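User: Predict Pleurocidin-like prepropolypeptide's structure from this.
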Amino acid sequence: GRRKRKWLRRIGKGVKIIGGAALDHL
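Assistant:
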């Protein structure tokens, strides 16, 4: 809910867990 300043796992689940970060930018 506020464990971290917008970084818990909102969109991280996509970039944090490594996914769209590397991709989505070929």
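Residues 15 and 22 are 8 Å apart (CA to CA).
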